[PDB]
């Protein structure tokens, strides 16, 4: 459904490192965070999500409603501040982010215990698979 609630383990991660090459992280951050899992504890009522993405290096936070604008600050990923809006379509979770970067934004959906997770930047896209604990 549009209840994405749940402890979600990562399976799957393709293209980490083109995506964090179009945000300019350094070589060194993305020689660690291409060898590490995640976590995503998604925490969802009505259109209220507070998500937490976790890993033994970094991890980052957002909470968001869906429908809202909020200005995001990419605090200790690439440090830039975009408009972030997330909507549904459908049952995909869609996050544009307005900035500096072109294409940059992400989208979300889940059949059953299998979450889907796509990152854009630039012409990069990662795709994760994350299966509900």
């Given at each position: 459904?549009?209840?994405?609630?749940?402890?979600?383990?990562?399976?799957?991660?393709?293209?980490?490192?083109?995506?964090?090459?179009?945000?300019?992280?350094?070589?060194?951050?993305?020689?660690?965070?291409?060898?590490?899992?995640?976590?995503?504890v998604?925490?969802?009522?009505?259109?209220?999500?507070?998500?937490?993405?976790?890993?033994?290096?970094?991890?980052?936070?957002?909470?968001?409603?869906?429908?809202?604008?909020?200005?995001?600050?990419?605090?200790?990923?690439?440090?830039r501040?975009?408009?972030?809006?997330?909507?549904?379509?459908?049952?995909?979770?869609?996050?544009?982010?307005?900035?500096?970067?072109?294409?940059?934004?992400?989208?979300?959906?889940?059949?059953?215990?299998?979450?889907?997770?796509?990152?854009?930047?630039?012409?990069?896209?990662?795709?994760?698979?994350?299966?509900?604990?």
């Amino acid at each position: 459904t549009r209840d994405q609630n749940g402890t979600w383990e990562m399976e799957s991660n393709e293209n980490f490192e083109g995506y964090m090459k179009a945000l300019d992280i350094d070589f060194a951050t993305r020689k660690i965070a291409v060898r590490l899992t995640q976590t995503k504890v998604i925490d969802q009522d009505g259109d209220n999500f507070k998500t937490k993405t976790t890993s033994t290096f970094r991890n980052y936070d957002v909470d968001f409603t869906v429908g809202v604008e909020f200005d995001e600050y990419t605090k200790s990923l690439d440090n830039r501040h975009v408009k972030a809006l997330v909507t549904w379509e459908g049952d995909v979770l869609v996050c544009v982010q307005k900035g500096e970067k072109e294409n940059r934004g992400w989208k979300q959906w889940i059949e059953g215990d299998k979450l889907y997770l796509e990152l854009t930047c630039g012409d990069q896209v990662c795709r994760q698979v994350f299966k509900k604990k």
